Each structure stands twice: as structure tokens, then as C-alpha cells.
Amino acid sequence: VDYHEDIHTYLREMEVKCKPKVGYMKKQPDITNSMRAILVDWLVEVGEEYKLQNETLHLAVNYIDRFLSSQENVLRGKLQLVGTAAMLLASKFEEIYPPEVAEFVYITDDTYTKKQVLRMEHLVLKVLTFDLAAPTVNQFLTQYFLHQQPANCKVESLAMFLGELSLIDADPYLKYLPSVIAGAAFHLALYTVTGQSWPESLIRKTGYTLESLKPCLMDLHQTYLKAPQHAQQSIREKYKNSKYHGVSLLNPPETLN
């Protein structure tokens, strides 16, 4: 506890509005899910360099997806400029001290000039119409954590790890709401560390059973099993650190029942 319940109701309302179409990429003619995976992988590395919050990264990915759902023809040469602006916007919304515009040039190695980034910023804001307060997997996770008292830090970091892994693979994660991936991620974290399951209080809160979470939980179990073999590796690198309790080093479970 008297705002926690109204905020969860409000976030559940808005995660259905702040939405991209699943089948947007096949219409986007010069881009694939493959290229998207490499860009989202890159922003993690950027996040680490400038010690940015996880929320900032979750927001940027939301902006990028919604922008490709709207704009018709994005040339693959522009795809990284879209990402640089999305992350600049998210940093302005969410960080106390957002990195300077010159810093966001420095990391492209002068691929794009200052003019081009401020120009791409404007275009994104017009397309999204300043609707930048999007619900994230991170925001829902942060709410679920309050139902494990006292907090288990190892479960928290592993849930964040698994939520961040969902951002890379448009197929399949675009056809699940943030609240569902958070549910699947928390239950998977809780079961691997403690052997416990999606608790009764979070069933009362969300109205989600473990049956409803099954489709998403089974996709996230497979990503976790073969995260060692994935072409993108920046997230695993990130979560080996003692800041995140070294949770990427943990062996996944073989079965779930």
C-alpha cells in the first residue's frame, strides 16, 4: 500500500493503447526482425557506457517498435539513427541527468551529424504525438516484486534479466502485453532460484492464472535455455556483473513441471 491498485488498473488500460501491430516488419520492406535484434543489442551496450536505468532501454524499444509500425519505408542505413533518437527521447523523459546530444553523436563514430539526430528526434515525436508515458515490462515487474517480502534480490535481477531478453526477439514477443511477459518472467525467476510458483496474491491482483501465462512462459523458457547460443550477447554480458548478482551465470531449469 492507497494508489498502488489504481496505478496497476491504469497501467493495464494504457498498455493496450501504446501498441504496435505484430505483423509490421513484413510490410517494412528493407528491414527484418534480424536487423532489429542487432540494434536492440547495441542500445544495451550504450545503456552500460552511460550508466542509464533499465526503464530508459524498455521505453526506447517501445518508441522504435511504434515508429516502424507507422512509417512506411525506413532504409536500413537510417535504422541506427532511429535508435539513437528513441534513446535520446527516453533519456530526456526518464533520467535525472540525460547524456548530452554530442555524446549520442560520439557513440555512432560520426555516422550521423548533430543536425540529423535533432531532425530524427522531431520526426519520432510527430509520429508518436508526444505519447511517451508507455507501460513497460520493467514497470509491471517492479509492482510484482512487492509480493515477495522480504525481497529476494536474486529473483529480482533474474526477472529483469529475462524481461530484457524478451526485447531482442520481435518474433515471438510482439504478440504478448508487457504485464504477461512480466508474469512469465517473475514465475520463471522464482521457480529457478527458490522452487516456488506464481503466488496466490499476484493471481488476485492481475486476475492471471498460471494457465493464462503458459503460452508466454514456454516461449521465455526456450529463449532462456538457448540464450548461450544467441547471436546477440550484450544482455548476458551485462548481468554477469555483481551489480545484478551474477544471475546470467545460473543454469536454467530443464523442465517446469
Binding site: 492507497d2 494508489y3 498502488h4 489504481d6 496505478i7 496497476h8 491504469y10 497501467l11 494504457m14 536505468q53 526503464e55 535520446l88 527521447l89 530526456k92 523523459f93 535525472i96 540525460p98 546530444v101 539526430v117 535533432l118 531532425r119 528526434e121 522531431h122 515525436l125 510527430k126 508526444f130 505519447d131 511517451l132 508515458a133 520493467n138 514497470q139 517492479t142 509492482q143 512487492l146
Partner: protein
């Protein structure tokens, strides 16, 4: 038609103000009518409201703002605040210059420049934000975490300021602010506020003051009005009354909507 109007990469204050205000549709929050964006200018169009509470208070220095109108204004302000916190928004700059009134008897929260969305639970956010006079002790003592409670504190200051027609805690610097709060509410300790002695900018040296009776602090208020104020100026931000619960205080049992001068 008459409007309030603001012109000017694109600043963080404008990204927050537009993105958050356009979700906040409530009769006690200033309406953002329209946003026009060009490759040169960015325009924010707000509903026109007569004057700010600071200019009404000075122009009311002769008689002071009458109690029925004070009760009405605080009731409406708490409805707007309750709405903000319930759509995960902190104002973080409540002062009389940012509360706007019309001729018909309404008051509204304005200037969402310093505002932002908050997670549940909250992280450490911007180190110090509220204007010195209206700033909550937890910010001055430099706690990791602040939340909804800082807006209720600022509002409690505005409540007393309407009733006595002067700033409750008008301090010059951060350490002067505390000494003005401590004089009136007494020096806090582990009893009233479990935490204080841990927190980074607290010192054992801090001087002692005994608590002052609200009969003197805000004389013309009844028992119910004095009860609500102490519940809005409570030290521990976990035990400080919420905007929601404040609406159910017996102070409001006889609330109405008077018309200003």
C-alpha cells in the same frame, strides 16, 4: 478566444509537461487544449484562467480569503492531486504561483514543467526539486526515496498560508529551512520518525525544539481544520495522509462552492 500560450534539442521539461498533461483530464487540472509542433517552433495552448493564488492572496491582504472559500479550494486541490497520484504523476512544484483560479469559483493545478511519472516502488529521483519554502523535510535531509508525500507537504504549506496570509516556513537556505520547520513541529527523533538518525544529511548536533500547539500556528481554524493540517505536515512520509484519505476528513463534511470577488 482567449488562451494561455507557451513557445520556444526539444527540452526535457516540454517532453514531460506535454506527455503527462495530455493523459490528465480532470476539472481541477489545467486543460491542455492543443499542441502544434513545427521544424522551428513548439506551441502549448492551455485554457485561460483569470489569476494565480499568489496574486489573489495579496489582493485579499485586507480581509484574508474567507474560510468557506479556503475549504472549497483545498477540497478541489486535493481532488486534482488525488487524480495525479492515481495516474502515477508527481507535480513536485506546488506553490501559489502554479495554482490558477477562474471567476466561477474553481481552482486548478498548473505548470507540470518539473513533473514526472513514478514507478511503484519509487527510485532515487532529482536530488532537490521543490521551491525552498514548500519543500518537504525528507528532500532537505537528502533521503534516497521521495514520493506522493512531498506534494501533500507542499499543499499543507499552502493551506496554512491562505489562513494566516503569510508563508509558514520562509527559509533562506536548506539548513535554515529545517530550523524553521523544527521550531513549529518540534525536532524529530526515532519515536515520531523511525529513520531520521540514519539519513545522509542528518547530524547528532541538530538542536532541540518542543512541538508548538496549532491553536497558535493557525489560530482561526476549528478542531477539524487543525487535525487535517497536522495530518498533512506529519514528519514520517509513510504515515503522512494521502490526497484520497484527506477528502474523507470531517473538515469537509459541510463543503460548498463560494464565488470569489
Amino acid at each position: 478566444v482567449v488562451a494561455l500560450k507557451k513557445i520556444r534539442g526539444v527540452p526535457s521539461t516540454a517532453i514531460r509537461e506535454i506527455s503527462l498533461l495530455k493523459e490528465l483530464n480532470h476539472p481541477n487540472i489545467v486543460k491542455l487544449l492543443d499542441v502544434i509542433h513545427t521544424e522551428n517552433k513548439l506551441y502549448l495552448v492551455f485554457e485561460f484562467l483569470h489569476q494565480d493564488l499568489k496574486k489573489f492572496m495579496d489582493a485579499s491582504a485586507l480581509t484574508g480569503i474567507p474560510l468557506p472559500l479556503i475549504k472549497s479550494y483545498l477540497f478541489q486541490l486535493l481532488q486534482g492531486l488525488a487524480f495525479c497520484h492515481s495516474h502515477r504523476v508527481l507535480h513536485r512544484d506546488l506553490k501559489p504561483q502554479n495554482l490558477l483560479i477562474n471567476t466561477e469559483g474553481a481552482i486548478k493545478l498548473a505548470d507540470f514543467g518539473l513533473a514526472r511519472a513514478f514507478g511503484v516502488p519509487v527510485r532515487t529521483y532529482t536530488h532537490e526539486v521543490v521551491t525552498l519554502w514548500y519543500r518537504a523535510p525528507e528532500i532537505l535531509l537528502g533521503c534516497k526515496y521521495y514520493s506522493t508525500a512531498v506534494d501533500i507537504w507542499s499543499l499543507g504549506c499552502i493551506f496554512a498560508e491562505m489562513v494566516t496570509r503569510r508563508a509558514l516556513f520562509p527559509g533562506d537556505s536548506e539548513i535554515d529551512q529545517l530550523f524553521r520547520i523544527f521550531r513549529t513541529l518540534g525536532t524529530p527523533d526515532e519515536v515520531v520518525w523511525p529513520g531520521v538518525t540514519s539519513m545522509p544529511d542528518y547530524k547528532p548536533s541538530f538542536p532541540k525544539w518542543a512541538r508548538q500547539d496549532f491553536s497558535k500556528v493557525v489560530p482561526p481554524l476549528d478542531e477539524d481544520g487543525r487535525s487535517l493540517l497536522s495530518q498533512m505536515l506529519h514528519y514520517d512520509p509513510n504515515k503522512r495522509i494521502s490526497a484520497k484519505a484527506a477528502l474523507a476528513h470531517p473538515f469537509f463534511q459541510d463543503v460548498t462552492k463560494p464565488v470569489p470577488h
